Amino acid sequence: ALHVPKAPGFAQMLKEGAKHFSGLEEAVYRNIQACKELAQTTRTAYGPNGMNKMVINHLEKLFVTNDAATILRELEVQHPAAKMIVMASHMQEQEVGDGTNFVLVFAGALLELAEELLRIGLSVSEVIEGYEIACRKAHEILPNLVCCSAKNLRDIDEVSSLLRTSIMSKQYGNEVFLAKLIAQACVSIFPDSGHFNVDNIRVCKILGSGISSSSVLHGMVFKKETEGDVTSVKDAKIAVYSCPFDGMITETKGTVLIKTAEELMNFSKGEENLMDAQVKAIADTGANVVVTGGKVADMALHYANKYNIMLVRLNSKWDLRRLCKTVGATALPRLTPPVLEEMGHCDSVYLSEVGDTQVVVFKHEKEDGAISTIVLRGSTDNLMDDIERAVDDGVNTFKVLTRDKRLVPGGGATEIELAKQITSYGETCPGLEQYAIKKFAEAFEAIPRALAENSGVKANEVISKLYAVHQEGNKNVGLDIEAEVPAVKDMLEAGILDTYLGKYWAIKLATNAAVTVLRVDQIIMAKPAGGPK
Amino acid sequence: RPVLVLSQNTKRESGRKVQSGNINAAKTIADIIRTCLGPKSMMKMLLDPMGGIVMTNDGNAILREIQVQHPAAKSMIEISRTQDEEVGDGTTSVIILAGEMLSVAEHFLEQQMHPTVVISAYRKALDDMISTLKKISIPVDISDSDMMLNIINSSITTKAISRWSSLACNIALDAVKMVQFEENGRKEIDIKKYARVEKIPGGIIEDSCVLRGVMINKDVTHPRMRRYIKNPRIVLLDSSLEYKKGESQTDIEITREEDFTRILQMEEEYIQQLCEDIIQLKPDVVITEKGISDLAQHYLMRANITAIRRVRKTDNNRIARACGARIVSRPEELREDDVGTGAGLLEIKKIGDEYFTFITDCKDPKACTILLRGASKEILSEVERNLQDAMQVCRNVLLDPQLVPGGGASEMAVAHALTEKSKAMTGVEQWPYRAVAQALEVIPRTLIQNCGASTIRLLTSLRAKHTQENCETWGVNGETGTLVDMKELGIWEPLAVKLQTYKTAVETAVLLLRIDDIVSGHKKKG
Amino acid sequence: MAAVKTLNPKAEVARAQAALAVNISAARGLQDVLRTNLGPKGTMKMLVSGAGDIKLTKDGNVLLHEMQIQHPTASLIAKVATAQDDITGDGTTSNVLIIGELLKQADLYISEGLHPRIITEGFEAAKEKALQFLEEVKVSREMDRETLIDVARTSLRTKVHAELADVLTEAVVDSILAIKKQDEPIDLFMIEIMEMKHKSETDTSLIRGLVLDHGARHPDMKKRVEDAYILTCNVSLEYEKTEVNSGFFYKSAEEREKLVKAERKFIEDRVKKIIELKRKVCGDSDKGFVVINQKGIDPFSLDALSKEGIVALRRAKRRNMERLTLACGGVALNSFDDLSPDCLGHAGLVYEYTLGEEKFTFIEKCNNPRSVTLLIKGPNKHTLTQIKDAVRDGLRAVKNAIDDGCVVPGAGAVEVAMAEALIKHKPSVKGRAQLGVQAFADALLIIPKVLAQNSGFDLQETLVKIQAEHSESGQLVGVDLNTGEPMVAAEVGVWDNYCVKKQLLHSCTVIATNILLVDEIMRAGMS
Amino acid sequence: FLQQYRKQRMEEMRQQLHKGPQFKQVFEISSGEGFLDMIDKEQKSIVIMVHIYEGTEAMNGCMICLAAEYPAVKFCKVKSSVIGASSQFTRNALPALLIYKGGELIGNFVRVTDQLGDDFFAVDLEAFLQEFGLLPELVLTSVRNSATCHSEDSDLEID
Numbered sequence A: 001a002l003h004v005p006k007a008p009g010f011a012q013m014l015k016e017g018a019k020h021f022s023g024l025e026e027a028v029y030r031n032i033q034a035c036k037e038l039a040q041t042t043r044t045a046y047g048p049n050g051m052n053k054m055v056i057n058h059l060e061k062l063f064v065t066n067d068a069a070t071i072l073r074e075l076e077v078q079h080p081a082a083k084m085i086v087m088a089s090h091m092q093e094q095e096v097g098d099g100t101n102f103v104l105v106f107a108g109a110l111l112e113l114a115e116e117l118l119r120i121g122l123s124v125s126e127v128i129e130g131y132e133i134a135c136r137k138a139h140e141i142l143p144n145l146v147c148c149s150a151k152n153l154r155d156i157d158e159v160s161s162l163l164r165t166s167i168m169s170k171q172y173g174n175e176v177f178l179a180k181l182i183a184q185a186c187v188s189i190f191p192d193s194g195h196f197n198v199d200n201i202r203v204c205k206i207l208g209s210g211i212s213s214s215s216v217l218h219g220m221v222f223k224k225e226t227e228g229d230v231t232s233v234k235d236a237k238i239a240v241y242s243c244p245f246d247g248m249i250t251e252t253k254g255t256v257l258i259k260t261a262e263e264l265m266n267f268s269k270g271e272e273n274l275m276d277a278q279v280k281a282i283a284d285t286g287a288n289v290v291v292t293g294g295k296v297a298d299m300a301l302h303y304a305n306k307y308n309i310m311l312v313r314l315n316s317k318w319d320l321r322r323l324c325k326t327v328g329a330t331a332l333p334r335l336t337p338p339v340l341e342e343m344g345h346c347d348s349v350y351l352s353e354v355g356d357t358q359v360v361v362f363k364h365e366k367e368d369g370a371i372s373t374i375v376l377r378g379s380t381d382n383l384m385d386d387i388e389r390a391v392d393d394g395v396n397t398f399k400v401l402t403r404d405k406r407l408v409p410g411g412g413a414t415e416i417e418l419a420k421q422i423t424s425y426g427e428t429c430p431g432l433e434q435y436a437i438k439k440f441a442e443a444f445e446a447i448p449r450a451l452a453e454n455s456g457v458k459a460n461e462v463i464s465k466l467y468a469v470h471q472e473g474n475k476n477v478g479l480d481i482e483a484e485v486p487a488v489k490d491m492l493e494a495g496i497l498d499t500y501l502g503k504y505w506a507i508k509l510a511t512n513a514a515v516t517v518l519r520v521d522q523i524i525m526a527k528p529a530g531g532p533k
Numbered sequence B: 001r002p003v004l005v006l007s008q009n010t011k012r013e014s015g016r017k018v019q020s021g022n023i024n025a026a027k028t029i030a031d032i033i034r035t036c037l038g039p040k041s042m043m044k045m046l047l048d049p050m051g052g053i054v055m056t057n058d059g060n061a062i063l064r065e066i067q068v069q070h071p072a073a074k075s076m077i078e079i080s081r082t083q084d085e086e087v088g089d090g091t092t093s094v095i096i097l098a099g100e101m102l103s104v105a106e107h108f109l110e111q112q113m114h115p116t117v118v119i120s121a122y123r124k125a126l127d128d129m130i131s132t133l134k135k136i137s138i139p140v141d142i143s144d145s146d147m148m149l150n151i152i153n154s155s156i157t158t159k160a161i162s163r164w165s166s167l168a169c170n171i172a173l174d175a176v177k178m179v180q181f182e183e184n185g186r187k188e189i190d191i192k193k194y195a196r197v198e199k200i201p202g203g204i205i206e207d208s209c210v211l212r213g214v215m216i217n218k219d220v221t222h223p224r225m226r227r228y229i230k231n232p233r234i235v236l237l238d239s240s241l242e243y244k245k246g247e248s249q250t251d252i253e254i255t256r257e258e259d260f261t262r263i264l265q266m267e268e269e270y271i272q273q274l275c276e277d278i279i280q281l282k283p284d285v286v287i288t289e290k291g292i293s294d295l296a297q298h299y300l301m302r303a304n305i306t307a308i309r310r311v312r313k314t315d316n317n318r319i320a321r322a323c324g325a326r327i328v329s330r331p332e333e334l335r336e337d338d339v340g341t342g343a344g345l346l347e348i349k350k351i352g353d354e355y356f357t358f359i360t361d362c363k364d365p366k367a368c369t370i371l372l373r374g375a376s377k378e379i380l381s382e383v384e385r386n387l388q389d390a391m392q393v394c395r396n397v398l399l400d401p402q403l404v405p406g407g408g409a410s411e412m413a414v415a416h417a418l419t420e421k422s423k424a425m426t427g428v429e430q431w432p433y434r435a436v437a438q439a440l441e442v443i444p445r446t447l448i449q450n451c452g453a454s455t456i457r458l459l460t461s462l463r464a465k466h467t468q469e470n471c472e473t474w475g476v477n478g479e480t481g482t483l484v485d486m487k488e489l490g491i492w493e494p495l496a497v498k499l500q501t502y503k504t505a506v507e508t509a510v511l512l513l514r515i516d517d518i519v520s521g522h523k524k525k526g
Numbered sequence C: 001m002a003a004v005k006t007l008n009p010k011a012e013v014a015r016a017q018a019a020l021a022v023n024i025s026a027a028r029g030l031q032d033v034l035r036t037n038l039g040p041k042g043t044m045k046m047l048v049s050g051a052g053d054i055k056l057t058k059d060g061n062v063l064l065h066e067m068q069i070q071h072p073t074a075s076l077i078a079k080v081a082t083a084q085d086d087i088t089g090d091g092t093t094s095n096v097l098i099i100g101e102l103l104k105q106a107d108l109y110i111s112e113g114l115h116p117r118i119i120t121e122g123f124e125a126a127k128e129k130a131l132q133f134l135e136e137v138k139v140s141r142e143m144d145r146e147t148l149i150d151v152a153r154t155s156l157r158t159k160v161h162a163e164l165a166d167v168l169t170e171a172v173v174d175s176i177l178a179i180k181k182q183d184e185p186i187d188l189f190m191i192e193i194m195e196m197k198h199k200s201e202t203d204t205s206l207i208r209g210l211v212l213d214h215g216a217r218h219p220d221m222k223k224r225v226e227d228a229y230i231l232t233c234n235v236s237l238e239y240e241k242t243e244v245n246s247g248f249f250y251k252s253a254e255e256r257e258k259l260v261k262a263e264r265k266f267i268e269d270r271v272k273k274i275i276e277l278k279r280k281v282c283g284d285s286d287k288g289f290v291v292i293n294q295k296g297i298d299p300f301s302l303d304a305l306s307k308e309g310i311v312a313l314r315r316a317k318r319r320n321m322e323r324l325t326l327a328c329g330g331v332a333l334n335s336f337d338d339l340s341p342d343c344l345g346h347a348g349l350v351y352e353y354t355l356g357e358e359k360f361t362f363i364e365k366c367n368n369p370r371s372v373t374l375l376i377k378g379p380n381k382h383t384l385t386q387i388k389d390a391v392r393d394g395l396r397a398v399k400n401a402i403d404d405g406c407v408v409p410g411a412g413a414v415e416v417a418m419a420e421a422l423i424k425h426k427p428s429v430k431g432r433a434q435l436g437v438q439a440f441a442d443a444l445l446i447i448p449k450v451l452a453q454n455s456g457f458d459l460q461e462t463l464v465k466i467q468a469e470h471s472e473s474g475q476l477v478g479v480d481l482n483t484g485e486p487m488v489a490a491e492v493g494v495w496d497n498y499c500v501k502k503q504l505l506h507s508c509t510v511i512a513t514n515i516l517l518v519d520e521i522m523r524a525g526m527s
Numbered sequence D: 001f002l003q004q005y006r007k008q009r010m011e012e013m014r015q016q017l018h019k020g021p022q023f024k025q026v027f028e029i030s031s032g033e034g035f036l037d038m039i040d041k042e043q044k045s046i047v048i049m050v051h052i053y054e055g056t057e058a059m060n061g062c063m064i065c066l067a068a069e070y071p072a073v074k075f076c077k078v079k080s081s082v083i084g085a086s087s088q089f090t091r092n093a094l095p096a097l098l099i100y101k102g103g104e105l106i107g108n109f110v111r112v113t114d115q116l117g118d119d120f121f122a123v124d125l126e127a128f129l130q131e132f133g134l135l136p137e138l139v140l141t142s143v144r145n146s147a148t149c150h151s152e153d154s155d156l157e158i159d
């Protein structure tokens, strides 16, 4: 009478380390609590007033960022439901590029209100069907909330103004300058053909002079030095070789067979003459720069020096391909001289030092090309990493704008209008799904509430003001950050706009994640064991 | 430090207690599978140390999965294996009989009888048992299909497959009949190599059949190969159809421009020459035990030939027997008589999610594949064991067409005969002789105990019945607990099985009675 | 105590009623876990592996595989379910439920001193009668598109939710109809299932063609071809070394260069053969040339091909040779000894799509493909796994419907009818096997009970309503999962595979009979 | 999908039928000096494989099956308490396939339940060992033939 035995059946057959959570309270409520905890963890880094977080992963690397996706990646979340929500956030990051924190906050709010509805008496199926109905309604409503479109993408000013909002959530203090940089870099890319490639924007981080000294280069920059004695050219004629800059060798086995003294005495002289002839043939085409992906032989380097040819050796194959795209060359597989159409042309190639870093610059005088580089300056490695993340967010925003040009007001205007209209709709439909629809609408308040909390004012006052102002019929009104008192202002005038595609995909993925978590009823976890990878 | 005339790890024990321990260990082994005998037997679940599960009621299968320490138990297990390998049936009976004779011998060993006297009496009794069993046998005409089927039924009526008795009996009879062979005046059956049993879980057990040919778990090497050929001319090979190195060291030395291309072209031409040599015989299917190069596949396909590679040697021999082919290693020596004509159909069909190659219309095959399809793997394994018992019994009958009454009738008849013999012994060995004779009643007793009927009254009735004149075929019904004439019930078992059982039981008893000392712990000294 | 423990002291033995108690407890535990799976209204389970991989599942076989269980009887039941899934592809949860209920009902009489053998005899007689009745009740019917859609719905609705099931039904039915040839067995290998991880789960669809998980490895190759000639080849176009240790020997640099140039002549020959064929077939720039190779292609050959406007892929799957032959219509080649326009396929559109770091190549607009592909699209890996399992179940269901000439009413209606028939036939069974027959009928009745229970309605009342309706009307009425009233499953459109039911009866009866006859369990293979 | 090791199942069924006269059991070492002079004895070419224990049962069965099907190798096992290792080894380093040949270490695998899994079978471990080139590369007699080979007096027919 001092021990409770395990119940006969499945309870006994379970393995030692395994855990079986079944039922509503033991599984659904625990999952909801874990997801709410994750959302609360990432909440404070939302909005322009979001605060950076120092995250140290298991490899001791230090991350200083307020990007939700990066925070979740560096954190090692162990709870399966929170893992599912993190998967949703990462999928949003991959599909769009910005809006991960919105996904996380919305999913957390949805699961919290789902727990409230389950406790008030509603079944899981009713909550799920109400959430799906409300998601369909929100997706139908969203096109009606579009305020203004991009209507131009080759303009420097419009692109900078459009990208300002995306890269003002990160790096709030100085966003105009970063917007100008990213706008110039994106407009340099993106030719008359509608396709825009995100990878065509390169970012080089050179320590030393604060981020205000960063610049945009219409070309490529490599953190290394030239092999030869020549350091600069003015009418570069790069000839790119994907082969080692040496005499090509056999593939089975090379064996120099010597049977007479004459062959022995002439072998090295003949080899040197052959290399000299090859390099002279290369130089005769006007190619004054030779970029090779392979190693550089000593005699080849000597003959390149003799003929005033600059040698750059690129280790990375991706770097070689990017250089070929930038200059318009072709990666030749042999050491043969390049024909006219395979010759890369650049305005200038030179070796220069930035800060204390030796770099090679492939600079174009034309405001065009295929690849543009954003040379990032800074005083800390972490600061430049965060600036790079902001640059990625801006570039992804530009890509989304190319895909769809419609924009909706930011600063909680879209979320509050969505909540108002969904609540109004939910009163009309009778049945037990009205509670779920109303809760889905209410979950949209978590966005302006998070913004108001991070900005330091009372959230309830802001939400009430938003409802009032939208009640008189202004659907472009969001909270005013630049105020120490609860206040609102027209978001369309202020230029605080965010992409329609971002909101659409974020809402869809957040709803899908919340519903999928709610669907789970029983959890059977295996013993953790190991599995580092 | 101690003088230690023997090693410190040497445990030695001797005397009456050693004999008592040996006989008790044998009795324990017999008791393990005592309830697995008879038509109303109950299966046992055995947990293999590798994680497998064996669910069976075969004596040898159960005793094979036991790790024992006492050497007498090891001897009993070896006896079980010997009986199973020699004749294939009667594995529980021999264990039970050995235990019983050892018990009745221990009874005398408690008194002042020397074990050699008991051994001599046992050997006399064994000779008389053999004589009586040969006397009460009856001949069987093996040309009667119904009689052979009835014999097989009585063989498998005590196994789980007894529900599908007609199907299993027909499968076993057909397999044994068409694996029979005779070359150069030497006759054989050879169930071990030919007559393979392939089990595929799923389907229903009634779908099981014996094929007029063989089936292997293989697929054509190339998608464009034909998967259905009417009357194939199968050719079997051992050698690879690739380009491989020789046995010697054969480094080349290339100095001209075109020698590399020449080497590669000669490799291709060698493959073409091999494929042309094979094509010369106009075959339809090529089976080989080793690889087939892709170029070889192209060359064969140019001639509309289906090719299968990496077939195990045993399967290739079985195919050779089935379709009347000959395995050839060097294609240049492919005679016409090596081409296999006789396979009436070749079909690569898909069962479940796997491809199986069927050659299933052979005209007079000498090998076969028994295709088992059942609920799961363990059920199919038990069915395979039962089918093996049936085929072994059929082969035993075909080799020796003698039969003896079953269901404990032969045991009681022999016991009564030896009891009547012992009335004229007048010696001191009459008591062990009579005791070992009466030890044969353990089989009817176990049958009655498993049936559930009352043991004492039925054994008394049977013993009284066997005292009459023409009552040698009177045994006990296994599933109703009633005395019955076994020329009416129709339960018979091969004379060879009974002779082997009695021989092995008495020999085990003698071997274990000859021991009175155990020395253990010494190193192997390898 | 036991003889085994006397022989082997460290032996685990459970004898007599202990064996039955252990086996029946394990079966009841498995049944209790798998009860909630049955029916479209069943609950979902999230299974977390040791490595932390999340897998959402409702399939019975998948759940059995990934429950942390170490029981022998559970292992036998899992093997039976594995065979059931391998052959038929659907019915594993029903298999486990029927086994568990058979054992429970048999124990209900065994605990009253009845010998298990009598129960097994009753089981066999009942199984024979039930098989006869199932033969009587099956609905033989030529299966056009709508019947197959109904069967696929009946499976996929149980595996996934409503809209996803609705999409998957059309996908799988159309795929089966595309790859099926009249009066020929169906080769499910010809329906490739490819995973992408970028759209919503409702974007999964069917491509009347093929999808490859790799693209052109040369940047200068065309990314999109309008009119295509497909050359399915199995020749290594990369550099290969001599099999007999050739090695090179030169006396000067020029000789070395000559040897280097002349050592690639062999592969250049095959590349030039391909190029000449391409030049012959399409002398304009309108038609494209695609070369799919099962073996690698070295960069030199890639450059030589791409200079002629030929897009080439390497390291194709072995099954993809047959798939491309059946879809495009060409001939898979193991050499270029004699190649002509005859051995060229066709494709009305070939293009690649880049997803993250993975390139996918699409081949579409074929003339009349005999092999198509299903593109699973979802936001998460576990979503893709769940959709793949559901698609496997649905494809197996449609194939089973096609193979059989008949389909069987579902929703537990046939279970109720078979139970009624067995009860009617019970008097004709001689002896005490009538108890076994009654146990078998009660066990067959588990399916409607579990369906009603999972729908939330009362078990006994719903079952008695169904039984009364069937008895009074004689129709094949089953459980309605929304109201609990009886419904004619044939009229509604709830169909079950005849082969699945037959396999259920056979396997469940056989394994239950074998387990009941086990008198003791042993483990003495140690020391 | 040749990466899926189709032959693994076939090898499993081949190894299911170990031998005729049972499959014996792994020898247990009960002395540190027994371990020492067990390594010391045998020739250099003879391979000795040792297991330290207190997921062990499955790998023990794997060694049983291998030793049944690889008579040349001398699979054996020992208790961790017999040697008396450190707390870390007796706590979190038990499953360790220790391989010896000629007295020098060749395979020093430890914590094998990670790199070998937990549900692995005999063929899995056999392939894991053979890819290392650590396992060295036949009809069944009736029972025996040979008793002793000492006298070369066999047969002669001198007039």
Ligand SMILES: Nc1ncnc2c1ncn2[C@@H]1O[C@H](COP(=O)(O)OP(=O)(O)O)[C@@H](O)[C@H]1O
Pocket: A045, A046, A047, A048, A050, A068, A098, A099, A100, A101, A102, A103, A165, A166, A168, A169, A170, A409, A410, A411, A412, A451, A478, A479, A480, A481, A496, A498
């Ligand atoms: N000046 C501003 N005033 C009010 N809201 C703003 C302002 N700038 C940005 N926001 C809001 O901040 C949100 C962006 O938060 P962010 O940190 O980017 O999260 P995510 O990266 O997940 O989008 C947008 O929804 C936008 O409405």
Ligand SMILES: Nc1ncnc2c1ncn2[C@@H]1O[C@H](COP(=O)(O)OP(=O)(O)O)[C@@H](O)[C@H]1O
Pocket: B036, B037, B038, B039, B041, B058, B059, B089, B090, B091, B092, B093, B094, B154, B155, B157, B158, B405, B406, B407, B408, B447, B476, B477, B478, B479, B491, B493
């Ligand atoms: N229907 C039956 N009635 C009575 N005795 C039977 C019946 N069937 C078989 N027997 C007897 O039972 C014995 C078979 O038991 P079995 O389990 O096959 O032992 P083993 O496996 O060692 O042969 C045979 O000696 C046979 O005479």
Ligand SMILES: Nc1ncnc2c1ncn2[C@@H]1O[C@H](COP(=O)(O)OP(=O)(O)O)[C@@H](O)[C@H]1O
Pocket: C037, C038, C039, C040, C059, C060, C090, C091, C092, C093, C094, C095, C154, C155, C157, C158, C409, C410, C411, C412, C447, C451, C479, C480, C481, C494, C496
């Ligand atoms: N819409 C439906 N209405 C009523 N019964 C259904 C419906 N769909 C499926 N069923 C029943 O549910 C059972 C299918 O259960 P399922 O989850 O597929 O188990 P398994 O996967 O083991 O086959 C079938 O017997 C079928 O009769």
Ligand SMILES: [Mg+2]
Pocket: A098, A099, A100, A166, A169
């Ligand atoms: Mg953002």
Ligand SMILES: [Mg+2]
Pocket: B089, B090, B091, B155, B158
């Ligand atoms: Mg027998």
Ligand SMILES: [Mg+2]
Pocket: C090, C091, C155, C158, C393
């Ligand atoms: Mg199903």
